Design a protein around this ligand. Structure first.
Ligand SMILES: NC(=O)c1ccc[n+]([C@@H]2O[C@H](COP(=O)([O-])OP(=O)(O)OC[C@H]3O[C@@H](n4cnc5c(N)ncnc54)[C@H](O)[C@@H]3O)[C@@H](O)[C@H]2O)c1
Ligand SMILES: NC(=O)c1ccc[n+]([C@@H]2O[C@H](COP(=O)([O-])OP(=O)(O)OC[C@H]3O[C@@H](n4cnc5c(N)ncnc54)[C@H](O)[C@@H]3O)[C@@H](O)[C@H]2O)c1
Ligand SMILES: NC(=O)c1ccc[n+]([C@@H]2O[C@H](COP(=O)([O-])OP(=O)(O)OC[C@H]3O[C@@H](n4cnc5c(N)ncnc54)[C@H](O)[C@@H]3O)[C@@H](O)[C@H]2O)c1
Ligand SMILES: NC(=O)c1ccc[n+]([C@@H]2O[C@H](COP(=O)([O-])OP(=O)(O)OC[C@H]3O[C@@H](n4cnc5c(N)ncnc54)[C@H](O)[C@@H]3O)[C@@H](O)[C@H]2O)c1
Lengths: 440, 439, 445, 439
């Protein structure tokens, strides 16, 4: 009958979303608004919201239901629609000039295993608002949850009158189909949301490519910060979706003056402090791999789970695992994506800033600071040059939750569009009405 | 004090990298002083006219008095640091700021079409955004490009700028372009040229902006002002000898006004060719062995072209006109010459459809002349070009006779449009949670 | 071509107590978050967009005022509830450089006194309250006596919803007996920081002579110009739909046609084709003018907002419900041209050229600088009359209500300020601009 | 050629009436040329200096060196035609443009405090908007305003402007100010002065912009850079001898750092009066029987104010500093003298609430020196002034040391804020139904 959006071949998946895009060029702005709203109701439906949130966890073995229940709702509510497509206007003696945001064509989107449903909802809303179709390439670990969402969207858009196959994917998401999608001529723009290997891959294809890379965000806490509030926002921001967010705090850098009071307020807020060098080393055997990287089995796991594996039984109060280590520690250097939070002590905030730049590894992604000194907040904000910089709040404030602005799950650091929206999936066009319609 | 011109490619890259790391420690007023310095170098009449002849002399393309306007339009209507605006959103959750920060060192590739205009354009926009620019000019514009880079480097040193903000190579060539592409220390690539260099910077694993080519059609219908349309068409097509990426390249005339349009094209300096044999002869000259325009004719005047087929002509003639079918290579192949075929159609509604077809999905430039709002709306929306000019010459889309700012790096494939300082900057967010909400 | 182309309830017995209660409401509103404002604005929206009260509020205004029709007011009440800007209208400007960061913000005014008309009684209460409360203000309403009960009723459902949402009491207040005296009482109260007048030229003249900041949304007399290049078929349909909209009550609705002579006759045919009753007999035209005009040359109160079928019945002409307006071709000095009848009566004046049309439309506008419409296809003539007539709203090739967001691009409003320069008023129009300079800090670029 | 100055108010208005009609036929480039002409007038060095001595000498208020900075600030950072932005939104129902269009003839009433800065600032804003301006300046600054207007007409005459775009009366007074406000052909009033003239223009049945007065307090808290705070408060309070409506007029310092603040304020040229006998001598000198400021002392230097009480000191002194209770008249009155009282409070929240109290709900200007981003936000969000400067001099709220544009007409009651060209324009909406939606 109607297409379910899922095809057996990447080539005809691209050819199907290529025909959809052209048909989609006949649909009015109001059609886009109904389609965009149709995608919101699909995920914000309470039966679907709870279903995608827990099933993703069931299939990926990462994150938790309660938090992807919030993240999925953030992608549905705070993702911009067709209002994002603004129009610049310049009226003068030479008439008028309009600048619009117009469809690219067909977009290929490569989505991660840390925000499988969130990224698809966030991409599809923006890419369809800008008048594009999208060919998705999900991470094969999130294959089942992603295609089902792809299918749920196709059904809703069919009931609204949309052209078939505005959102599509493949039945067997693989590394080969992802490469196949990057090579297909009809694909006009690529959007990559993942690690450094995939971001550099879409940049080598001869096509327009949005690159959302990895992070390693430090959170500086100087003597000026509200230590009680700082330690609360840290635990919440680090335990959020079990540290899967690319913004989630992954190492603490505190000045010696307030460090012991920070650790005390951190434990008070649900941190389990590891002080014995043996159980710490015992923890490194659990969560690390060969080549000193993170184990995907431990990635996205809870603090209850990780301490269960080293013979420590704690209740549900424990949200993170705390330890004060040197800066060379692998938990500091690596993007653990786990509620494991090291803490490096430094003499002054200037040393905390100069170190936070180093452990950023030039990712230019996310950095957090707790401090009420404007001069010190703007010195770190200027020097580290990250795409998102949160101040006196949990890191998820930079995604629109607890912070001002809209929400996105594709954050462009390398290619540099920042928090991508519908403007990011559109071509910039200029229209010059010479010596007419200067009605000032 | 360095001159901004280095012996090898790795030397210029490593010096711009040290420059931008030092450029970061500057203020916005320093950026504004260096921006004005770049404007001063080209807008100086002594240098302006030197840059306009050397480009015509060395490359052998265009004329000097039109490059006089193109070089001026670049240093005059290019956005400066005022292009870097700030977005703010305040409420219960605090204050959000969105800024345009530096990328780092930018590698820039320029065409033989507009050597100096593109250097002036990229320098202002990239340096205003806090970047440094490593230019890799075409070998056929080498000596004028190196002269302009040194004049800028000289000027900026007298303003207190860190050295090597604008750098280039002593021996520009194809392989120096490829060494700038592979250099890990280049953060952004901007390419203003053919379709092969654009896909090459798009295949290097780097952030790349590609300003592609086109084939701009101009549609005329029974509703247009025919006298002003034929003046705007000849002026646009013959601007800098049809070198600009925006200049008209073929006409599509509604049959109802096609004859009266051909008369007013003549009255405004168009030389029509009616004998099919003399129209063979120019196909022999400008089109070469296997169907592509010949680089020796590209950028030459209409008088120079008519002389090569033995037609001595006064400087009144600005273009070579001919009524011709839609399959003739003069309509399909981007000539970049003051040769302007015309295709006659019955209707305006597939005058539009024919224009979309001959544009060849470049979605670059299209022009239309008329009085009906719905018809200008219909063609401007369906053809989906980056620039669409209504009731004026093509260069009106460059800030010359139209509203908006000026650019010589118009990104088609990569979607930035008329690139400016913002186009060469990283969008960064800054969230002050639960503070600075002063409403 | 001759063818064209193809807990308090909110209501107080005295005016002063309404202001004193609205001032106390301002004190407490300043302690409420933007989310509270958003929930209170969203509260008002549910008040009018709830289908039962939506039908309910529409029949009232027709029953109490005798003006307009029910189905079109069902459209105007929904248009105010949906397309009026909320707290998203309060945007922020930011400037960042070497000297730090400067923000400019829209901040509340305090207590606002709003004077509403009888032609749009509930639409203006919805629209004023949304933007005024979104900007962080409290509003005192002085309704027109003719639409007393429908206005009093809406303000009570508003005070009930907001209370149920935890809003400070008396955020939106009014008087128990609206009167011109209670209007002058509001104009003179020192606690009222701003005035907003939506009515005739006399009420706008008053608010600007009180010693307070005032937004004056005055009257209109919009002409509609059709030249030989217009889509005459579409022109006639838009003109009849726009003129008859809510029985010509809107300040935007068409009031007189200025048609180029070449297409004027074909235009009339397509006006009749779309439900215009053409009056040719000199005598029966006198009957309507004797019925519609008063001794002072102004419109008849008992006839304002009455249907075209109702007006034709009173002169002894029975017609079916397909007739929406009344059409007569008359000279330019005819009263129906010079007066804002606010009735489905449409005069047409024929002119030689489009140049003459643009000039007479300027002459007929009466310097209201409010609304003007022109159906035309040439960009140069559209540009000429738009730039020249200088109206607050200018509509091209559409119905007049496209300047309200109905079939046009933008937000809706029912307070359209011309002589005071605010344009189509929204939350920004009801707020003060504040500049916050952070010297040599927060420049993070 | 007319010089713009007329014998009667009615003759000036009618001249500005017909001039504004003729103005409506001019282009944006024409407006741009006239605006730049008014910039060149005041920014000319000899004219910049001339205006500044002539004002001080004719009014007896302010100092030369600071009115040099301020007159430069009005011609250099006042918005031009770039201030008149266009809004636009397109979709299915077509295109909608929003534009800023001129009112008509505007009447502007300038004050003695800044006679030249307001004429330069007003005239640039209202001509940029396409309006004409009839000026009714203060009689105390009578000949400096007519010479400034005359010099302006000569410049506009040379540029090709319609005669009498900026006009004034030969004999300024308040009698013809009323004539201006009661003239049918004036369309907006712009009153820049005290609370009387503001309510006067708002009672005329006409659109009016009223820029009232204020009593700006500056709050210092324990987080403030005391060496930098004490420096900025002296530069800001003694700026033009406290004449600017923005200039600090009383300090509210927390007890923790109040003595070290006064310690560092004297390093910057403060004179502490500790003997109530000497202090009362100032009181009887500068206040009035009913406690108002004395016109003879307004704008007088601190050196001169101390000479009227015998105390002789050099020009190193810039202000007269006194620690004093809150109810004292120096705190409560907009003195516009370099007299700066200090009110010590215990906590920053006492300072915040007190600065709210002494501001008298003028909601005009307030300053705060502090490093805590929470306290800066708390006072800004509560005092609700149209200018709020943080960690800098008062005049940083007028583009001199801060971000943004400058103005000299600050609308507090009427709510326009820092009036620019946009303030003197009507918003018009232009709806193209079902056309020009080319997205
Ligand atoms: N900046 C952002 O917006 C953002 C958002 C979510 C996740 N991430 C990052 O993703 C990373 C972890 O998620 P992940 O496990 O899905 O990483 P991942 O790179 O393994 O997977 C991302 C996607 O890219 C594909 N991919 C990866 N390598 C590829 C290759 N060599 N060739 C072709 N395709 C390839 C994968 O199939 C997958 O679909 C983290 O580093 C996180 O920072 C970034
Ligand atoms: N969109 C714009 O802003 C713009 C402006 C001017 C010209 N153009 C286009 O550029 C073309 C004319 O300029 P051009 O002849 O110099 O184009 P081009 O193909 O030569 O590209 C310009 C640069 O690319 C380099 N280059 C080209 N091929 C290369 C290769 N195989 N390997 C390494 N480097 C290579 C050249 O060294 C040259 O410096 C036209 O197509 C015109 O439409 C576009
Ligand atoms: N510009 C706009 O946005 C807009 C919108 C709707 C209606 N209007 C105009 O309103 C008028 C129709 O409404 P109306 O019948 O209520 O007219 P109206 O002028 O009599 O109504 C003005 C309101 O203020 C009261 N009022 C009238 N004159 C007053 C006076 N001299 N002093 C004090 N109060 C006075 C009235 O009781 C009424 O409540 C039309 O002229 C229409 O153009 C304008
Ligand atoms: N808000 C601002 O932007 C701003 C700017 C400069 C000065 N001011 C204020 O102005 C005052 C200092 O200047 P000033 O001495 O000229 O003030 P002022 O009130 O004495 O005079 C202002 C102008 O308005 C006229 N005027 C005053 N009262 C009038 C009345 N009742 N009727 C008719 N005309 C009247 C005066 O003739 C004069 O031209 C201070 O209070 C200062 O705060 C405010």
């Amino acid at each position: 009958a109607v297409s379910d959006g899922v095809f057996e071949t990447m080539d005809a998946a691209v050819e199907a979303a290529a025909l959809a895009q052209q048909q989609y060029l006949l649909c009015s702005m109001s059609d886009r608004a109904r389609f965009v709203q149709g995608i919101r109701d699909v995920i914000l439906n309470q039966d679907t919201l709870e279903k995608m949130s827990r099933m993703a966890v069931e299939e990926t073995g990462m994150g938790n239901y309660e938090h992807k229940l919030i993240k999925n709702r953030l992608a549905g509510e705070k993702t911009p629609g067709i209002e994002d497509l603004t129009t610049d206007a310049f009226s003068g003696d030479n008439g008028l000039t309009l600048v619009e945001y117009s469809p690219f064509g067909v977009i290929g989107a490569i989505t991660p295993t840390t925000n499988p449903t969130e990224t698809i909802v966030c991409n599809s809303i923006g890419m369809l608002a800008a008048g594009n179709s999208v060919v998705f390439s999900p991470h094969p670990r999130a294959r089942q949850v992603s295609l089902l969402l792809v299918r749920l969207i196709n059904q809703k858009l069919a009931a609204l009158g949309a052209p078939e196959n505005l959102v599509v994917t493949v039945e067997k998401p693989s590394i080969e189909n992802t490469n196949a999608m990057m090579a297909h001529p009809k694909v006009r723009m690529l959007v990559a949301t993942g690690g450094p290997a995939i971001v550099k891959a879409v940049l080598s294809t001869g096509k327009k490519a949005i690159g959302a890379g990895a992070g390693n965000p430090p959170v500086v806490v100087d003597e000026t910060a509200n230590i009680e509030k700082a330690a609360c926002d840290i635990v919440n921001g680090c335990s959020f979706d079990n540290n899967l967010p690319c913004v989630a705090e992954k190492e603490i850098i505190a000045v010696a003056q307030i460090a012991d009071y920070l650790i005390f307020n951190l434990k008070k807020n649900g941190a389990y402090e590891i002080k014995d060098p043996a159980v710490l080393q015992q923890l490194q055997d659990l969560v690390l791999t060969a080549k000193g990287g993170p184990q995907t089995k431990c990635v996205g796991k809870s603090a209850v789970w990780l301490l269960s594996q080293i013979g420590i039984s704690v209740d549900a109060s424990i949200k993170i695992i705390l330890m004060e280590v040197p800066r060379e520690h692998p938990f500091v250097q690596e993007e653990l994506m786990m509620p494991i939070l090291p803490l490096v002590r430094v003499e002054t905030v200037d040393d905390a800033i100069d170190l936070a730049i180093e452990v950023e590894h030039d990712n230019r992604h996310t950095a957090i600071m707790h401090s009420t000194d404007v001069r010190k907040l703007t010195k770190m904000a200027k020097l580290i040059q990250t795409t998102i910089f949160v101040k006196n709040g949990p890191s998820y404030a930079g995604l629109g939750a607890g912070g001002e602005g809209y929400s996105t799950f594709t954050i462009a650091g390398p290619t540099g569009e920042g928090l991508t929206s519908a403007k990011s999936f559109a071509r910039r066009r200029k229209c010059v009405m010479v010596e007419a319609l200067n009605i000032r």
